[PDB]
Design a protein around this ligand. Structure first.
Ligand SMILES: CC(C)(Br)C(=O)Nc1ccc(C[C@H](N)C(=O)O)cc1
Ligand SMILES: CC(C)(Br)C(=O)Nc1ccc(C[C@H](N)C(=O)O)cc1
Lengths: 310, 310
């Protein structure tokens, strides 16, 4: 498991693999990601932070953008309230064990030269290309605002201004990332993580859809959320419980169940688990119990560090 | 002819007349207009500058924006070349007899607080409203740029930042102006001048359509441009020669013609001229001769001041 495959583990795509290999050669290399401040930090965020921790462990300097101005452009409210939530998110990201530089976007995204470059990019980005890149990001609006098409080019320029070698994000960021690769003089290596399914299976996990496990949920809340979740026997695709087993749990994995249902089960890889699940050797109730208890233990240190403040 | 009707003469609309009357009450009041720098200054510009001269004569302080950044957003090239053309335009506007403050937009349109307010406005302006306001302004593009929708909200904010009581422009600016009236806390009085017809009658006069008389055209060039112009007998609407008689000439007007065509004609108002033209008492050839020679004399001082530099 070289550093490449360590970075590559559980990503949806790397754009591009050859470029990432060149970047690994450098003594000095930086990786960046941004987050619109969120009232709750959920497993979708945690997935990203894990991936930033991998990069850090491969010798990357990590830059986290607390994207207060992007959230302002995406209709999350007033900058001061956004910035307060930004500060809470940093604490959560630190309680996740991430050592990084944290910057508020508004610290640099309003300088004369940043703005001028945003306007340069606005001359090279068609409205159609801009609106396409925001399809999975833009706040739902029957009357889309001009702010929606400023957003993607400000994120592009952020890549430029921060000078990262690698940009990380969920797959929803990939069209903004493609735009950065076409417009900017230095091509940024782009690493896209999968988009988790919502707990009810009905769509993608979102802080505004209320279908997530938050990293500071109480254990009873974790158990009740898993218990209700979409999780049909033998169905792996779009199954948020299997996604959690694949993305967050440690193997080998011991799955406790009564002797009358086969007794404790040990699986040495998520791949074995998927096999046991597909040919319906492992029942959804037992998968849920094991996933909930392991997730509880995995999230425990984070919830404890956050509760230590009170 | 109070100051109101003097300001109102030969305008298409005043938004609104009651508001303009309130503004006239003030000892201190300012009027503003912007121009994307243009290689040639034509009668469309001159019409506007005349209207600024009226306002000045009514006691307005005049602010002319040399809109280098708007022209940059509207694909007129590089800022330095735009700014050079900006400087030429000022000279022309001064040779027209306008005493005013001249500012390059880029002097203030990149400050942190200006930019932040542009982004505030971008949150309140729908893409559809923004693209509607640019229909008569935007450079022709099969693939419209994001820059096209930044333009109108930057012009709105310019009104705000410069604090004018009155905004002046051609009718094509009216939708941007309407947006300023809805978004800004202080409603700006908007004065819209007519859009001149191109010399060939086929559309509106434009510096990029090459259908204009420039204020520094030589007399032979003026005569040849008038001679070729669209100008059908009895047709007033869309007739650029009548527009010039209405908007630029001084009355009473003596129209020279041979005795065999009726001999010299004196008309005491454009209204008489329109009457003589409609019931086909005045032939297009004689109208053209008179319009060209009077326009030559009217533009003479401007062409001379511009030529004095060489
Ligand atoms: C400048 C660097 C490279 Br650190 C960066 O990635 N900036 C960035 C990234 C993502 C977001 C939010 C995002 N579009 C979302 O959907 O939440 C905002 C800013
Ligand atoms: C700030 C004040 C009030 Br002085 C102003 O009117 N600014 C302004 C006006 C017009 C233009 C150009 C115009 N859209 C065009 O079509 O040429 C650019 C800037």
């Amino acid at each position: 498991m070289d550093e490449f495959e360590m970075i590559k583990r559980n990503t949806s795509e790397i754009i591009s693999e050859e470029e990432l290999r060149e970047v690994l050669k450098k003594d000095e290399k930086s990786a960046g990601i941004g987050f619109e401040p969120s009232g709750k930090i959920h497993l979708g965020h945690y997935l990203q932070i894990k991936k930033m921790i991998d990069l850090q462990n491969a010798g990357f300097d990590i830059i986290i953008e607390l994207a207060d101005l992007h959230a302002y452009l995406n209709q999350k409210g007033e900058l001061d309230e956004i910035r307060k939530i930004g500060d809470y998110n940093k604490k959560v990201f630190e309680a996740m064990g991430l050592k990084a530089k944290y910057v508020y976007g508004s610290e640099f995204q309003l300088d004369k030269d940043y703005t001028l470059n945003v306007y340069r990019l606005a001359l090279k980005t068609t409205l159609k290309r801009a609106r396409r890149s925001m399809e999975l990001i833009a706040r739902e609006d029957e009357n889309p605002k001009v702010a929606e098409v400023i957003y993607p080019i400000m994120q592009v320029n952020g890549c430029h201004y921060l000078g990262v070698d690698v940009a990380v994000g969920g797959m929803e960021q990939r069209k903004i990332h493609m735009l950065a690769r076409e417009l900017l003089p230095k091509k940024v290596v782009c690493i896209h993580n999968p988009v988790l399914t919502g707990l009810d299976g009905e769509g993608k996990m979102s802080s505004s859809k209320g279908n997530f496990i938050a990293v500071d949920d109480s254990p009873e809340e974790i158990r009740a959320k898993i218990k209700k979740a979409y999780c049909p026997a033998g169905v792996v695709e779009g199954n948020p419980i299997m996604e959690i087993a694949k993305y967050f749990l440690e193997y080998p994995l011991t799955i406790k169940r009564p002797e009358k249902f086969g007794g404790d089960l040990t699986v040495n890889s998520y791949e074995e688990l998927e096999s046991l699940f597909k040919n319906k050797e492992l029942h959804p109730m037992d998968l849920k119990n094991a996933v909930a208890e392991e997730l509880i233990k995995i999230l425990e240190p984070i919830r404890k560090r956050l509760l230590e403040h009170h």
